[PDB]
Amino acid sequence: RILPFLGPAVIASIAYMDPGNFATNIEGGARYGYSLLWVILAANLMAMVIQNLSANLGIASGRNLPELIRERWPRPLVWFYWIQAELVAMATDLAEFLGAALAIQLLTGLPMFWGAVVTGVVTFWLLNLQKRGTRPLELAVGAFVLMIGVAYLVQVVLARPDLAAVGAGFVPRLQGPGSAYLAVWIIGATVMPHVIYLHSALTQGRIQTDTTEEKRRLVRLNRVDVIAAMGLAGLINMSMLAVAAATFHGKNVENAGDLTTAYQTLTPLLGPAASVLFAVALLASGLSSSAVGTMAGDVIMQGFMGFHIPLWLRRLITMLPAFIVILLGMDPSSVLILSQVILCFGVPFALVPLLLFTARRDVMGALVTRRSFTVIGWVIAVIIIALNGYLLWELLGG
């Protein structure tokens, strides 16, 4: 009624400031300063449009994106969509689980194993907020997102960034490879597929309506909510870029990508509090997006398949890759890479059904996405798919 879809929007935004974005934005600032801010902005406004379509999809149609895929498309393709999404929600949760567990290690020093054990029970409880209703989880991530922003505003004011150099960083341009490659990373690996499905689910039948006029009133309300929540995610990501830029650019800081070193190098540069507020930000970022990713996986199979496995069981499965990595002891290289391959793999599968169904009257009724805007969504999906193919190309090889 007032802000009906902020919750759904905030649950969707947290995936766009997950630990994955922390490492990317940190390395972005550390290596090339502010010269990539325009990429974070452009990437965020693109996702802002995407998540707005998924939200509108659930509002107008009263069915989440996996639901419409289940009833409209053959079950061979649906079963693959369930498996595809499950791997995407699982690969995504991995970088969020490990990032959360890493944050605990930075705060207490416990081995990554127990840090992951802490991440499990806590991330589990965050989904018993989901068993009954959903508002409680929406405040949970809301309060978490709130502690991600204040953590990086106070870091920005500490990093003392050169607004002239921050503004110059918003001019679309780059200088050679690496900078260009990392920009392609931000464009390609920003849209989170698992949240494209979930967002429509948190909006379906959220406000019971029985007309076509009352629905479009929700579409206009939801639009402000998505832009507000997604816009927030951008500024935060821009903050993570500027802080790293305002601290590591010309400081001989190498290997700044991984967070276990940025946390360390922050103490002698900014201060010990800059490191703590960075670790808690990472912690809150990992717990939330992991819990959201777990709820995403729940509505994913519920919508694609119908049947529903216990959340604790689902929590346990997605929790195994993390411990496998910890008990193994590999570098984020093979981890951060292999996982983002699956996300880049699942981006197209999330946007193609979204742009199509949102352009059908048998799904949307009189709330079909304006043709002029359906186009803008496809050109957005094309370059993201294109740049996902390039990334996917560059790692796999060819």
Tab-separated table of C-alpha atoms in Angstrom, residues 63-306:
chain	number	residue	atom	x	y	z
A	63	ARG	CA	3.008	-16.073	-10.826
A	64	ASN	CA	6.743	-16.139	-10.252
A	65	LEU	CA	9.148	-16.644	-13.126
A	66	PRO	CA	9.778	-20.357	-12.373
A	67	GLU	CA	6.017	-20.898	-12.082
A	68	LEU	CA	5.356	-19.441	-15.530
A	69	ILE	CA	8.256	-21.453	-16.938
A	70	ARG	CA	6.709	-24.592	-15.428
A	71	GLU	CA	3.238	-24.111	-16.929
A	72	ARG	CA	4.228	-22.546	-20.270
A	73	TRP	CA	7.322	-24.523	-21.306
A	74	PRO	CA	7.919	-28.277	-21.684
A	75	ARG	CA	9.030	-30.073	-18.542
A	76	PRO	CA	12.344	-31.203	-20.111
A	77	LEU	CA	13.319	-27.531	-20.339
A	78	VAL	CA	11.787	-26.858	-16.913
A	79	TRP	CA	13.743	-29.653	-15.231
A	80	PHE	CA	16.912	-28.215	-16.764
A	81	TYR	CA	15.868	-24.785	-15.493
A	82	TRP	CA	15.480	-26.209	-11.989
A	83	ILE	CA	18.882	-27.909	-12.140
A	84	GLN	CA	20.469	-24.852	-13.762
A	85	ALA	CA	19.029	-22.520	-11.123
A	86	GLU	CA	19.956	-24.870	-8.271
A	87	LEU	CA	23.590	-24.820	-9.406
A	88	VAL	CA	23.424	-21.035	-9.783
A	89	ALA	CA	21.961	-20.556	-6.305
A	90	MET	CA	24.545	-23.044	-5.009
A	91	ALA	CA	27.531	-21.542	-6.824
A	92	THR	CA	26.376	-18.081	-5.743
A	93	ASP	CA	25.938	-19.136	-2.114
A	94	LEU	CA	29.474	-20.562	-2.182
A	95	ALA	CA	31.131	-17.177	-2.715
A	96	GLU	CA	28.695	-15.720	-0.167
A	97	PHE	CA	29.182	-18.518	2.365
A	98	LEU	CA	32.981	-18.454	2.135
A	99	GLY	CA	32.974	-14.654	2.157
A	100	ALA	CA	30.879	-14.686	5.327
A	101	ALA	CA	33.105	-17.349	6.874
A	102	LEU	CA	36.203	-15.389	5.857
A	103	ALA	CA	34.801	-12.280	7.554
A	104	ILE	CA	34.435	-14.186	10.834
A	105	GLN	CA	38.048	-15.349	10.579
A	106	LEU	CA	39.156	-11.732	10.161
A	107	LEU	CA	37.155	-10.756	13.256
A	108	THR	CA	38.138	-13.654	15.543
A	109	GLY	CA	40.912	-15.599	13.803
A	110	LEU	CA	39.133	-18.954	13.948
A	111	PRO	CA	40.104	-21.420	11.200
A	112	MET	CA	37.911	-21.197	8.119
A	113	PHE	CA	36.225	-24.467	9.125
A	114	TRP	CA	34.553	-23.314	12.339
A	115	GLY	CA	33.943	-19.923	10.750
A	116	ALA	CA	31.913	-21.849	8.186
A	117	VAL	CA	30.200	-23.770	10.997
A	118	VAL	CA	29.129	-20.416	12.436
A	119	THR	CA	27.926	-19.343	8.985
A	120	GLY	CA	25.730	-22.443	8.739
A	121	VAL	CA	23.687	-22.316	11.935
A	122	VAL	CA	23.229	-18.545	11.657
A	123	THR	CA	22.298	-18.613	7.968
A	124	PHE	CA	19.926	-21.457	8.844
A	125	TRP	CA	18.100	-19.408	11.474
A	126	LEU	CA	17.728	-16.574	8.964
A	127	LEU	CA	15.399	-18.888	6.999
A	128	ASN	CA	13.195	-19.887	9.925
A	129	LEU	CA	12.152	-16.255	9.570
A	130	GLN	CA	10.895	-17.567	6.200
A	131	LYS	CA	9.044	-20.678	7.404
A	132	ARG	CA	6.269	-18.468	8.818
A	133	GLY	CA	5.503	-15.455	6.662
A	134	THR	CA	8.245	-13.520	4.897
A	135	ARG	CA	8.248	-9.993	6.375
A	136	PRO	CA	10.667	-11.065	9.169
A	137	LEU	CA	13.330	-12.000	6.608
A	138	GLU	CA	12.752	-8.734	4.741
A	139	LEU	CA	13.618	-6.779	7.888
A	140	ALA	CA	16.573	-9.107	8.521
A	141	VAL	CA	18.219	-8.276	5.200
A	142	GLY	CA	16.935	-4.723	5.573
A	143	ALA	CA	18.834	-4.321	8.833
A	144	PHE	CA	21.800	-6.099	7.239
A	145	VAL	CA	21.762	-3.928	4.107
A	146	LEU	CA	21.515	-0.984	6.504
A	147	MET	CA	24.720	-2.092	8.232
A	148	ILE	CA	26.430	-2.565	4.857
A	149	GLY	CA	25.778	1.044	3.866
A	150	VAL	CA	26.737	2.754	7.119
A	151	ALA	CA	29.846	0.559	7.129
A	152	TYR	CA	30.956	1.919	3.744
A	153	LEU	CA	29.810	5.513	4.186
A	154	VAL	CA	31.956	5.745	7.319
A	155	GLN	CA	34.761	4.123	5.319
A	156	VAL	CA	34.397	6.613	2.455
A	157	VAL	CA	34.611	9.588	4.820
A	158	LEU	CA	37.671	7.892	6.321
A	159	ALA	CA	39.235	7.104	2.937
A	160	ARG	CA	38.893	10.811	2.039
A	161	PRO	CA	38.410	10.263	-1.715
A	162	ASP	CA	39.295	12.990	-4.200
A	163	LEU	CA	35.828	13.863	-5.509
A	164	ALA	CA	37.567	15.394	-8.528
A	165	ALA	CA	39.187	11.998	-9.098
A	166	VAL	CA	35.907	10.306	-8.148
A	167	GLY	CA	34.064	12.435	-10.700
A	168	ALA	CA	36.712	11.852	-13.360
A	169	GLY	CA	36.070	8.164	-12.671
A	170	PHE	CA	32.481	8.536	-13.897
A	171	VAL	CA	33.637	9.507	-17.413
A	172	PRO	CA	33.176	6.340	-19.526
A	173	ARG	CA	36.718	5.452	-20.588
A	174	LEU	CA	39.455	2.955	-19.787
A	175	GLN	CA	43.194	2.546	-20.337
A	176	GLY	CA	44.239	-0.807	-21.753
A	177	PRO	CA	43.542	-4.350	-20.560
A	178	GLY	CA	42.902	-5.412	-16.977
A	179	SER	CA	41.002	-2.174	-16.475
A	180	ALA	CA	38.888	-3.084	-19.504
A	181	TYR	CA	38.692	-6.726	-18.409
A	182	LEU	CA	37.593	-5.826	-14.882
A	183	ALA	CA	34.996	-3.460	-16.343
A	184	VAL	CA	33.650	-6.361	-18.410
A	185	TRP	CA	33.580	-8.370	-15.176
A	186	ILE	CA	31.384	-5.768	-13.476
A	187	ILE	CA	29.009	-5.637	-16.445
A	188	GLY	CA	28.825	-9.392	-16.939
A	189	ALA	CA	28.850	-10.549	-13.318
A	190	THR	CA	26.352	-8.160	-11.742
A	191	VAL	CA	22.898	-9.577	-12.517
A	192	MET	CA	22.169	-12.420	-10.103
A	193	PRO	CA	19.932	-15.073	-11.726
A	194	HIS	CA	18.676	-16.653	-8.495
A	195	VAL	CA	17.259	-13.272	-7.446
A	196	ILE	CA	15.544	-12.712	-10.801
A	197	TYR	CA	13.369	-15.721	-9.966
A	198	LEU	CA	12.974	-14.878	-6.281
A	199	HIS	CA	12.023	-11.234	-6.821
A	200	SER	CA	8.986	-12.232	-8.875
A	201	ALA	CA	8.078	-14.696	-6.112
A	202	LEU	CA	8.214	-12.091	-3.341
A	203	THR	CA	5.902	-9.911	-5.463
A	204	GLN	CA	3.338	-12.502	-6.589
A	205	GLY	CA	0.106	-12.198	-4.620
A	206	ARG	CA	1.890	-10.009	-2.084
A	207	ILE	CA	-1.052	-7.577	-2.179
A	208	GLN	CA	-4.264	-9.419	-3.034
A	209	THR	CA	-5.983	-7.635	-5.918
A	210	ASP	CA	-8.910	-8.530	-8.168
A	211	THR	CA	-8.666	-5.925	-10.942
A	212	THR	CA	-6.359	-4.663	-13.671
A	213	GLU	CA	-6.348	-1.090	-12.321
A	214	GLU	CA	-5.269	-1.916	-8.767
A	215	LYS	CA	-2.368	-3.961	-10.160
A	216	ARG	CA	-0.787	-1.197	-12.253
A	217	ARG	CA	-1.006	0.874	-9.070
A	218	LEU	CA	1.277	-1.776	-7.564
A	219	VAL	CA	3.580	-1.701	-10.599
A	220	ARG	CA	4.145	2.030	-10.099
A	221	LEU	CA	4.698	1.470	-6.369
A	222	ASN	CA	7.039	-1.472	-6.967
A	223	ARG	CA	9.042	0.587	-9.469
A	224	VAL	CA	10.065	3.160	-6.859
A	225	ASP	CA	10.912	0.319	-4.471
A	226	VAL	CA	13.238	-1.493	-6.882
A	227	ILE	CA	15.015	1.696	-7.960
A	228	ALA	CA	15.385	2.659	-4.298
A	229	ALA	CA	16.745	-0.723	-3.197
A	230	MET	CA	18.825	-1.306	-6.334
A	231	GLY	CA	20.090	2.274	-6.387
A	232	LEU	CA	21.252	1.748	-2.810
A	233	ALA	CA	23.153	-1.361	-3.880
A	234	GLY	CA	24.956	0.693	-6.512
A	235	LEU	CA	26.139	3.491	-4.242
A	236	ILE	CA	27.374	0.871	-1.774
A	237	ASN	CA	29.292	-0.878	-4.553
A	238	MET	CA	30.589	2.513	-5.685
A	239	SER	CA	31.667	3.068	-2.075
A	240	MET	CA	33.608	-0.204	-1.987
A	241	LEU	CA	35.274	0.959	-5.206
A	242	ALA	CA	36.187	4.412	-3.898
A	243	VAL	CA	37.451	3.196	-0.508
A	244	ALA	CA	39.845	0.721	-2.120
A	245	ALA	CA	40.815	3.392	-4.654
A	246	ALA	CA	41.357	5.962	-1.887
A	247	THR	CA	43.639	3.543	-0.006
A	248	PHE	CA	45.461	1.049	-2.271
A	249	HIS	CA	45.820	2.717	-5.688
A	250	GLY	CA	49.465	3.784	-5.477
A	251	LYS	CA	50.453	1.938	-2.294
A	252	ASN	CA	52.224	-1.133	-3.752
A	253	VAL	CA	49.225	-3.194	-2.572
A	254	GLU	CA	49.319	-6.378	-4.666
A	255	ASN	CA	46.896	-9.298	-4.331
A	256	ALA	CA	44.303	-6.795	-3.066
A	257	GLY	CA	41.557	-8.810	-4.777
A	258	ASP	CA	41.106	-11.350	-1.999
A	259	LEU	CA	39.630	-9.859	1.157
A	260	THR	CA	41.996	-11.499	3.662
A	261	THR	CA	44.727	-9.103	2.457
A	262	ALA	CA	42.586	-5.980	1.998
A	263	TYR	CA	41.444	-6.384	5.609
A	264	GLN	CA	45.101	-6.469	6.665
A	265	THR	CA	46.353	-3.636	4.445
A	266	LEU	CA	43.510	-1.401	5.667
A	267	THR	CA	44.791	-1.294	9.254
A	268	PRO	CA	48.136	0.480	8.586
A	269	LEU	CA	46.617	2.684	5.844
A	270	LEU	CA	43.211	3.808	7.141
A	271	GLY	CA	43.013	2.250	10.597
A	272	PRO	CA	41.975	-0.817	12.582
A	273	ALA	CA	38.356	0.375	12.659
A	274	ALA	CA	38.331	0.608	8.862
A	275	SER	CA	39.222	-3.095	8.848
A	276	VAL	CA	36.578	-4.076	11.419
A	277	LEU	CA	33.768	-2.169	9.703
A	278	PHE	CA	34.959	-3.806	6.481
A	279	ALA	CA	34.811	-7.302	7.987
A	280	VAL	CA	31.380	-6.817	9.574
A	281	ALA	CA	30.191	-5.399	6.253
A	282	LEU	CA	31.585	-8.497	4.553
A	283	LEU	CA	30.043	-10.658	7.284
A	284	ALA	CA	26.583	-9.092	7.033
A	285	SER	CA	26.875	-9.164	3.239
A	286	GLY	CA	27.670	-12.881	3.253
A	287	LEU	CA	25.071	-13.986	5.799
A	288	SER	CA	22.250	-12.105	4.072
A	289	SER	CA	22.940	-13.007	0.444
A	290	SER	CA	23.555	-16.599	1.541
A	291	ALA	CA	20.190	-16.734	3.315
A	292	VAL	CA	18.482	-15.021	0.373
A	293	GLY	CA	20.239	-17.420	-1.980
A	294	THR	CA	18.841	-20.273	0.098
A	295	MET	CA	15.305	-18.882	-0.114
A	296	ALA	CA	15.837	-18.359	-3.843
A	297	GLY	CA	16.688	-22.034	-4.227
A	298	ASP	CA	13.515	-22.865	-2.306
A	299	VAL	CA	11.046	-20.989	-4.520
A	300	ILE	CA	13.131	-22.045	-7.536
A	301	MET	CA	12.366	-25.753	-7.184
A	302	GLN	CA	8.975	-25.134	-5.567
A	303	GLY	CA	8.009	-23.170	-8.680
A	304	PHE	CA	9.827	-25.287	-11.255
A	305	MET	CA	8.995	-28.686	-9.737
A	306	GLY	CA	6.269	-28.272	-7.111
